[PDB]
């Protein structure tokens, strides 16, 4: 099993700066419940986005993807290809938006969250993938999170 998991804005947006422009606690609260235990596969500017004090993530195989052959990522490992990093029984590719578009042909599942925030898309930003036809979604009701901004949550899913 290869999921994805995000947060996107309504208009796709996922990052932007090299960091992401909100952040909502219990979006928090959900990615670290889905993720816990398994494997987690991210790109290497994603890895540099976490300080050094919080990586690696805890309780998780963390992974990171670089073309880089000498690349040091202490408390995780450094593959060159995602391929190499789909071993475990369940992995979840956690951002940014190079990498998704690298596993959606291996990914089954995409756990997204919606950010009611109105975020028009600039060059530069990282995006969401775009799901085809082959995938079924399933929506949550819209939620408030603390941090001010309603957000809901959509489990998609394919065999
Ligand atoms: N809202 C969300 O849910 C999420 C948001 N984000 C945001 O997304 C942004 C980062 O996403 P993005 O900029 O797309 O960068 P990524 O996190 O996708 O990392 C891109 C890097 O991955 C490596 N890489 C890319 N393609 C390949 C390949 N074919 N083979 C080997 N290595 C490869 C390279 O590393 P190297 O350069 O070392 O070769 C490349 O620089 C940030 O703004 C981050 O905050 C991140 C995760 C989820
Ligand atoms: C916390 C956040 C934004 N939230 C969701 N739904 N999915 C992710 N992949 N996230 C994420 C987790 C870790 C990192 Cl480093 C970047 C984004
Ligand atoms: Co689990």
Redesign the pocket.
């Given at each position: 099993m290869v999921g994805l998991?995000?947060?996107?804005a309504t208009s796709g947006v996922?990052?932007?700066?090299?960091?992401?422009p909100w952040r909502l606690p219990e979006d928090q609260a959900h990615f670290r419940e889905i993720t816990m235990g398994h494997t987690i596969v991210?790109?290497?500017?994603?890895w540099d986005?976490l300080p050094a004090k919080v990586r690696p993530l805890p309780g998780r195989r963390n992974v990171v993807?670089?073309?880089?052959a000498d690349?040091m990522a202490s408390g995780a490992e450094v593959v060159?290809?995602?391929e190499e990093a789909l071993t475990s029984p369940e992995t979840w590719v956690?951002?940014?938006?190079?990498?998704?578009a690298?596993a959606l042909p291996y990914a089954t599942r995409c756990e997204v969250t919606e950010v009611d925030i109105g975020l028009p898309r600039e060059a530069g930003d990282?995006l969401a993938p775009v799901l085809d036809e082959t995938w079924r979604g399933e929506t949550g009701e819209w939620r408030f999170s603390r941090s001010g901004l309603r957000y809901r949550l959509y489990s998609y899913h394919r065999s």
């Open positions: 998991i995000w947060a996107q996922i990052g932007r700066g090299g960091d992401i991210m790109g290497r500017r994603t986005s993807l670089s073309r880089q690349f060159g290809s995602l956690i951002g940014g938006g190079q990498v998704y690298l990282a």
